[PDB]
A paper describes a structure:
Unexpectedly, several fish species encode a PKR like kinase in which the two dsRNA-binding domains are substituted by two Z-DNA-binding Zalpha domains. PKZ interacts with CpG repeats, the DNA sequence that is more prone to adopt the left-handed helical conformation of Z-DNA. The protein was crystallized with an oligonucleotide forming a self-complementary (CG)6 DNA duplex with a single T base overhang and resulted in crystals belonging to two different space-groups growing under similar conditions.
The determination of both structures using molecular replacement revealed that the two crystal forms represent two different arrangements of protein molecules on the DNA helix due to the repeated nature of the DNA sequence. In the form that belongs to the tetragonal space-group I422 the two binding sites on the same DNA molecule are related with crystallographic symmetry resulting in the presence of just half the DNA segment in the asymmetric unit and the appearance of a continuous DNA helix throughout the crystal lattice. Overall, the two structures are superimposable in regard to their primary interactions with the nucleic acid and they mainly differ for the distribution of Zalpha molecules along the duplex. In both cases, four monomers are bound on the 12 bp duplex in agreement with the stoichiometry of the interaction deduced from gel-shift experiments where a protein/DNA ratio 4:1 is required for the complete shift (WT). Based on the two structures, we created models of all possible arrangements, and we found that the tetragonal structure denoted as 6 + 3 represents the only arrangement of Zalpha domains that can propagate uniformly along a DNA helix without leading to protein–protein clashes. Although other arrangements may occur, as we see in different Zalpha crystal structures, the tetragonal arrangement is expected to settle at equilibrium with a long DNA helix. Based on this arrangement, we evaluated by modeling which of the possible pairs of Zalpha domains could represent the double Zalpha domain of PKZ, DAI and ADAR1, by being positioned in a way that they could satisfy constrains of a C-Terminus – N-terminus linkage between domains.
Numbering used by the authors:
A (entry chain B), B (entry chain B), C (entry chain B), D (entry chain B): 7 to 69
Write the structure that this text describes.
Amino acid sequence: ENEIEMRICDYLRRHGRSTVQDIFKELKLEKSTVNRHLYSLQASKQVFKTVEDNKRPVWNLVE
Amino acid sequence: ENEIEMRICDYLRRHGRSTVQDIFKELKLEKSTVNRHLYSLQASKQVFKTVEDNKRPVWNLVE
Amino acid sequence: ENEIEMRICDYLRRHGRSTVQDIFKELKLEKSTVNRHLYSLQASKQVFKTVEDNKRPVWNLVE
Amino acid sequence: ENEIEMRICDYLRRHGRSTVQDIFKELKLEKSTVNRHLYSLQASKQVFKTVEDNKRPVWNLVE
DNA sequence: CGCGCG
DNA sequence: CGCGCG
DNA sequence: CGCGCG
DNA sequence: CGCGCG
């Protein structure tokens, strides 16, 4: 869904840097569904993640 | 859902030993949703898994 | 231990805002031991936490 | 440790049904360490727990 | 799952 | 407060 | 890649 | 436990 992806991006717009756990609980979606879409949005240069060791990746909007 | 759990158990009744991947594609559910319910059904002695090394656990009905 | 508490505070000095999960894996201590000391250091005004909903508390040095 | 697990099982052999709180104070270990091992021993069919509502699980030796 | 809790 | 969870 | 985890 | 994986 474009709706899921809009809702994820809108969460990031309002909250800035967030983990998938942040996003799925607020949106009431499965974690795996939010992650599928985050990775897809990353591939499409709409969001990006930063990672450190085994930590939760942290997501934000590009630019 | 009792409906999800019924549908999982019904899959195992007809197919015997199965991996989560077997079950979620047929049922058209998320893998994580089917696994949540398999682990819950295992706790309630309705299904059991066998595991070997890092292999996919294989699930079946108890008795 | 004063040593544990020094090591926790030193982690926070170098890393800033961190969760207990950040700290226990680097320090190789139990999560519960690091949390016991974080709560104790908070009571002694040496660190503070900020919390939002059910999120991981995030810890940092006072001042 | 096999030593921790031996010590936990030995506690249960002598005391029968016990909570984690019973076991960690006598053994002078962290509660989380004793629970990690109880859950692991349960998976290996060496101990079992019974649970009722939100009560402390109660542990004993299998058979 | 936030948990530190003795 | 059940929590084991990595 | 085993992952269920809240 | 990082996991998105089809």
